[model samples]
Target chain A: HTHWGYTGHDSPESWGNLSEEFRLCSTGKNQSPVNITETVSGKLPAIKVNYKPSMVDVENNGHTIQVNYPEGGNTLTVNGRTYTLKQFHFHVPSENQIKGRTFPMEAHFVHLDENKQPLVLAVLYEAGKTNGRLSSIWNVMPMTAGKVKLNQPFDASTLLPKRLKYYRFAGSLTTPPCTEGVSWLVLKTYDHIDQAQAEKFTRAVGSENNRPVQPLNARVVIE
Target chain B: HTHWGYTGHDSPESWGNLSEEFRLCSTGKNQSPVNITETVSGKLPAIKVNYKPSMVDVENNGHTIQVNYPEGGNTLTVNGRTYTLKQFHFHVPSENQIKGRTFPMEAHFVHLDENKQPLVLAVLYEAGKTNGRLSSIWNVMPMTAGKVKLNQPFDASTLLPKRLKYYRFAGSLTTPPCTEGVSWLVLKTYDHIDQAQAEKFTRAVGSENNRPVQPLNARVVIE
Candidate 1:
């Protein structure tokens, strides 16, 4: 039998090399962990992720976007252009680097851009003080599969921490097909969320959400 | 109260006008459902889809690919480029159009392109005869949420009734921003699979897979 690495230590970038079938790895041009550059340079409009939360069976694809809400849906707009929130997930050991640093965990706000392009907003987290926002989400997480609902109304934007300083980059999905063309945003700092509360999330999701970190190569690391 | 038109008469094209949020309808340049011009150029390698049958689940999503075995951990190849079959699913009423016609139902063979680009191969079916091949799939459909295995093996290429003439074009997903840059292969002639089989499929999946057809504006009808 062959050995398969866990999501944290075994980076997706190296998965392709594991077998010939997963060629999307090194050959892929739009690979992730891309240095978030101000390439599109404008006011760099606030990232708008149009999210509509609905009650559905949410499973952790070993990545973040695991909090299962009984029912929820919302659309976010950034700089007038909108992206539909297909789903948000998380990863452990964080996939992105901020100023050459890594975090314990990362939250991927997966959204579809105006062109239906996939954009991921990643926020890193480390065990620390507290996370009222995360606590709020955990409190209402749908207990059963396929029954997702937002029970009560809460500010959807609250998921984003107070700090907006983030690294922006264009990359590919780190999963199978590992499709390129993903716009990535990695938040610079790790918000200290309560470890006990974080463990609750870990308990709910049996596995770690983090994908293995890929080689930065010549890719630029933005602040 | 808001209403959404079914994919038969209404589709991705009509989405822009359907709601204020479906801006992709009007603003998106690479909308799906473009005409297939039958680019008989270079014989294009005879347009092979080459999919394997495993267990399929059609309850919630129209159809899903549940590969029980892998050629070494389950990988799917298209045009020589291989992608791991992360997951497979279906969309009803045909998310795409063939020669400007929408069938009662369509099957989307979602493939992760070489770069992990999401590529979908659409198979259209009209109501006429019952399909044994499909029945082979539907009969074993997972009633419970857990994954199941396929007792019989199926090949995507052979699934066709020998009439494999196709209309190929590039378009976006029929859903939103309906991202362009996707290669679409729509078989020209409908391979009369059994109609009762078709009904079984519809019954298994309650009329939800089909996306309301999108506007044909700027969409070239190939073939």
Candidate 2:
């Protein structure tokens, strides 16, 4: 089967029936992109983030702007299972919402477990002073649905805020093959990216790629 | 579609095609049931198992003998993410392997994150001294493929061994829908269960419900 993307013909709504592999996109009891409203306060352990400078590559991938991380570049351990940073991607106007509010952009830091299972840390972006890291990345991001190797290495740690207080839940990849059961961590704090930076990203990628929020189902958001 | 199972037309081989939600079962880059061979040994944080006395129930679940823990009863935290102990089930003759060697049986401790994503801990069984915990469980196990509430509460912590050395990976649920990106931990230490105990569980559940080993692909089994 051909690959699917976030557009008119093969968009999010028709993903499940598009292929037998994506049934969970529609039928899964536990899905992602949920509105973070009701939550129970609990102690979530600190995310041990160990990131380093690594050669970076950018790909449009037809769905969103994705930055690939070199292997052995960075890692984060949640609970006891540790995941290596694979790539980070962007979605316009954020996929997840808090109190029915949306942000201008969101960056998903995708990591993989030993079995290559995905654990994503989502950092919401708002309008503010230009973010140095994002500014550097926007300089080399792919303009089309292709990939490009950057001239210099980038540090992923710059993308995150010092405060790790966040909400945790089990959701799925917000894209095709919408794989469910992904560990999602959305930081409570929002990082600032200037309007120009946001517009540049929107121009390189499409204006929007965020999935609509799904029903909470029999699940709760944890803090 | 009807729910899938272990034998006949609804077997593991046909799981990925059984539904669109299971496409990863066939095309996932990092699948599980890996023969753990290579290793970069390192210290995995200890699993803080805070299992308390919880009302326990047993069920056949058609595929295996599964024991369910009451919601909010027990929990385990690794690193800092905490998952509630949802249930623990068994597989005859094991699912994952070490150096291509299988065990008599394996116990899967299923925990769910705040988002309901599953994190499973697989404890392999070796024939040795009789296990007190297994005996207590088997004594009250449901005789058939239906659920039965135990007359008294049971403590799940008894099932764990004293040692916590383990191999960690990113794998999926070994059953249908075969969700990928699940956090899996295979305890390095084997739990002893007598032959009779194994036979009793086999009798109550079935002769087999284990998925055949899956290709390791580009993933590594970390210890």
Candidate 3:
């Protein structure tokens, strides 16, 4: 199958039609990047985050700046199922829009269960004061589209905000081959980053790397 | 909450705007009655149907002719999960389109799990020879939009075709309070009904009781 990008020819619009495996990118209901609107007040279990210090290795996979975690470095439990932390990634202008409001940047904490089922926890970021943990990675983010090993060990918990009230739903991968059945937990809070820090991420991953908001369909966004 | 209907002021187009609960009818990516196209050939476990004779209590419901079954009347098992058959309903001019072709009528076999999750099996009908069981229901159908008790016993299995190869996906109710997370199983095989038999159903439920085909979005119809 061919590789897809975020702009022009290989854009999200062309993703599903690109290949057979990627057909879910277009035809699958419960697609990702749904606008958070009309959410119901409900009780959702807190995401149990068990994280540890791991050697940081970042890669600009021509898509986004993805930070790789060592095997068993961290884990997140949702709906009584525990998923091992696989890696975390960044997106500019945020893929999912909250009530039609787009953020300057976002981070996706991707975890996988034993059966390889995905559960992504997203945190939106706005342009404001410099974030300490963000700066740690931003300062060492790979300049080109390649992998870079940082000498400093980092804690994944530092990236998350204090409060973790979230909007939960079923969605798919934002990129191609857009597989479905992923459980999405978007933190209903925002983090901050200096304007330049946000710009630095955009510069590294190109200006626009976010997919447009998709239809929510009969799915409810539980808060 | 206000009651919504099939046409005019409370039509499907105005469903989402009517109330927050029905917003998924418009914004949901995985809405029901999607046109079946570009399906992939795959192995799906056979649907184990266990239907028994139940007292026939039919309701017009102001949308279509619905036959209510007693609690625990029937059950269908798929993927090891058994859904208790609650009722079966009919729609004229078919809600789900198969390969861009519309059928004369469609029957939705509604079932629910212990958690009240819905699983619907749809069978498409074409005009051909007389259908014995369909005639049994049609001869005693309520003349107006109201509930009617039939003297004769009914079996839901008579509505199903002999072969059960189905196109499966996640969809929602085609009517008001359009809830998502419904498992849809549209049978690949079509059953025959006399032309007058199809007309009799339309006469009772009006010319158009079927919802227009909704967008497929990022969902795939797996066979």
Candidate 4:
């Protein structure tokens, strides 16, 4: 039941066929990995960043390299509703593109609001000056399926761009099951990662795991 | 739509008619306020007490008095799942009964997990020597519909019994629109409140607001 990946017949395409619970993957109206363009100007909620420094456990789950704060104490508040950060993973070549342009990588800070609904914040990465903030995660990144626990100070307080402007939309998980109604906040800012740093993430994640951009459909991306 | 109470026509029985979104109140299977009996001893998780001292905002909402910690940081962990404490309310003459015996009052510490699922911790109150911890809450109790914000150091660290043994069950909101799949933990312990203190809560709440216990139906009470 856990054999799906970014390749093979059990890849992202045939995930909806693997199990009845994953039926929404293909049949769902709203999905993620959208080419974020033509956003409608609307009143958007401010994502209050309260991310704290925490010891992390980096693990490669055969699908993607994921970093989790095992003893979760970090939270992100959006419009007074707070969501706990569970895992932050990478998607190479950025899954959801801005103006149909993808970057070297995209970092997904996956969270769930008080109602258990997904409220993910996506940060795109470009190859430039090496981001020192990612060293804690990169140093511990496992090449394949394994985990490495560290007490390094992984802080996201200064991780994002100074301006926290974003494109908000309702989408689904980029991976299998493709559950919809996920709150996506794609930041209109890019963080830099050098060539060595960008390649390290791709090697650890195994391959380009970015799901192809899906149709925008009836959903209107809000700015 | 904002009007509903524990009495008269707009009471819990007619809550389903109040709004189409409140359909769960009348038609849901695993509703709460269940009379917990018929034991099913199984592996249960320990409720870790990380409750903190918080200044409170006690408000009388006509239905019941609710104490909310505006700046939320307190949490309760069951096994590995953690829930954030939002508000702690009371019910006159406790809602859920154990062995057909009901207490004078009950305190419900409402929490939402990372996914926003409700995991309510119920603590029944029996009349005894006055509990000094509640003075900060009762001294500012509004007689009617209003709010009194206080900076008193209200703490729940020592509020619970030494032994954290509890009866676990799946239930719903005791109020209108009673959504189900709520995790309920009735502590096999009691807190104390004197005669005057109990009456103050009742007056502020207006009347006995405890819902009648519903049928257990097809649920197991895990001890």
Candidate 5:
């Protein structure tokens, strides 16, 4: 039953709270993400996303910033307000929770408002073949980090499937100082991507770079 | 066992080849991420991750920066290459893959090469309430998507629970162009966070946002 890789000595959970070197590990509330199982209820407003392919800029924010889909999509109508899709990014594993479950990767479609208040529409992605929209980018992914590369102009809509069933809840930021007061939306359907393409991105990043799941804090999750 | 959130047609798989709206769904070769079950020959070097605390640059990139973590104590070594700890991130639902399984949330401990090559170490999170590190960050989180202002710098190393068993494999990026040249190191043990924390994150992101699991593709996994 013992698996490959880290043994008892290199436990990641221990590393998180073991030393000052990994302060981000133990106390990083926003650092945890999980997979979701959508609860259905048609009360929430329709979550519409509209993004386009654009040049991507990767920086050393201690994380990888491969690229933000050129066309940002997020025409979500929540609480009688509209939030536009600004950009999206990836976490080695992911942030957020799904009825308090966990998954492999999570895609965050960061949204903004007229006053530019931030609203994020997050979706978690696991193993599979390349998604059509992602195929466009993966075909020409930048090898170097901190490098801003131009991507073919594409539509953000292409990244999403037509189905819009979803779960709704009021939550906080998935990272540290885990901010509360953000609208959360999760999709149940798990799209697939190819294997070869998956390697390209994984090579750039190391393996098993995700946080464990969290608990349910008596919050109301809507579908 | 369907839960609440985005479901029905909202599933990623359901939106197959519909329109160019969700290009990432198709174009991306390494569209979905996978949780690793196998390991390559000889345990790779212990991976190292070194990173700095995120500053309050919650302008475009950060809705709000996770300010609860102290800036230090993160290290991991892989293939003789050691990557220092970097700022980690979270995604709702999960990302990555594990023998073709998914979790609730995932984390990315992003590292950089001298030339800025990214070496990400991913980990998956699940639903639990014992995650002190996660709870700490959630307590100080912001309300909106801007920046979770912290009262002070939070140290992250103390979150680990003293277990390092894990899974290893090679995979791809979970975003656009979902590349395939990355290392995938999935951990067997999970660090805990809070349930309410995940609920907050789900509110904005919703539930059900994940790419389907990818195939092994006859690729040999190391243990």
Candidate 6:
């Protein structure tokens, strides 16, 4: 099932042959839709967000529009380490960028720590208002490969960006087996959505799922 | 265990971030250790090799040395598809090159068809005389990683190079999750070895495992 996607022959540089347990996608050295340009600010560790109130599930599945959370959900402390906020997806045009800018949509959030290792957080969406928590999960999106189960009450901190100031680094996992030690963070102030909510996630994941930036190489980005 | 290698943090442009079942090593479109330069001379498919001598083994495997045969090996028709040869390795400096030349060693052989795919065959070398079947598996290699089992009668067509004519394409698998539809070929007359047998395989894979040619995109090359 992980034959891979985002383009031809199970694209994304072919996801390292589609299996062999995804050898870090090809090898890895801290990869993630990179291109955040330079940075070293420091004084980091702020993104607190102790979320709560779960029960969303939306999910269009065929490549972007996720939103999971079947019951209890929350926790995302950062730097001092502490994750578990679990699901939160959507990509359209921004797969991480900021100084080289690029934003029409991008919301990761995913977390997991205590051994599962992953950190994400991202956020970056700018069009202009109307993101009522992204129509509370894009008006229960789910056009093709389906899934939906939110009777209501979903508050992922109203989908971030009140200023959590970020930009850390160490990535990998833009999709299929692209798993590096993860732990991004991005943010750095950005929030808005409504160019028809980024054209309803680019017509609900029909293409441009965004994943072509990478190459910050030796890496260095913290703020 | 496939964290990947050939350099820094399991290198090779980070095999597409390693995992999620290796997204075709970062969105494939026919990836391989590429770099055969230009070609189109037609009249393809003709690498026969009915090899049969099953019971060698000889591995060092910390990246290169392999020889394996086990119990029953032979068969490698082509285009009209046949494949089965299976084990055969080595790659000191060459990973796939000819027009832009760069061979100091290169073997491969491997095969599989029957829906298992993969068809290598390679064989480049070059230096002078002294390839007593690479000193019959480099005089019982095994200096580390481990796996030796040959005791005589090995004839893999004397490890080829009388001219089998080749240079086909469609690659992947220079290592890591770098697996594409695989089915290269290489050959085109060239084989020798001795230069102290390529410094005993560059002192038993101490470094330089070779993997940095890639980027032939849009594919081409077949003669």
Give the winner by lDDT.
3
Per-residue lDDT for A1-223 in model 3, tens only? 3667887656887676445567677778889988887888898998888888888698887789999986685988867889998899988888998878999898999999999999999999988888887777887888688998878887898888788789899999898877889999999778988778878888888757898889988899899
Candidates' C-alpha lDDT: 0.56, 0.82, 0.84, 0.83, 0.53, 0.76
RMSD of each: 20.7, 23.0, 21.9, 21.7, 28.4, 20.7
> How close to the true structure is residue B109 of candidate 5, measured as C-alpha lDDT?
56
How do the residues B1-223 of candidate 6 rate in per-residue lDDT, one tens digit apiece? 6567677865767767866566777777777777776898998867677664345678887888888775555777876778887688888878887767888888888878779988888888887788755676787888678887876445576578666888887887877667788878888888877777777776876676888787787889888
Minimal lDDT window, size 10, model 3 chain A = A14-23
lDDT of 5 at A18: 35
How much is A42 displaced in model 2, in angstroms?
0.6
Candidate 4: global Cα-lDDT? 0.83
Any idea how many clashes model 1 has?
A: 65
Predicted candidate 6 versus true structure: per-residue lDDT over A120-180, tens digit per residue: 8888878886867667678778767788887877878877767788878888888877878
Candidate 2 lDDT tens digits, B1-223 = 4478677787888888888887777877667677888887777888887776566788986778988876685889999989998899898878998988989889999999999888998899987888866665788777677898875456666678888888998888787667787999999889887888878877887667788888877677778
Comparing only chain B with the true structure, the TM-scores of all models are: 0.65, 0.93, 0.95, 0.95, 0.67, 0.32
- Residues A117-199, model 2: lDDT tens digits: 88999999888888887767787788888998888788898888999888999989887678887989999999987888778
Q: Positional deviation of B144 in candidate 6, in angstroms?
A: 7.7
Model 3, chain A: how large is the TM-score? 0.96
Predicted complex 2: CAPRI docking category: incorrect
> Can you write out model 5's per-residue Cα lDDT over A1-223, one digit (the tens) per residue?
1111112433445544333445444544433343444444557666655444445543322243345533434366666777776566665555555555554566666676777666766666666756676766565555554454554455556656567667766655554334455666666565555556555555555444454555444554676
Candidate 3 residue spans exceeding 4 A from truth: B1-223
User: Per-model i-RMS in Å?
Assistant: 9.6, 18.5, 19.8, 19.7, 5.7, 12.6
Cα-lDDT of candidate 6:
0.76
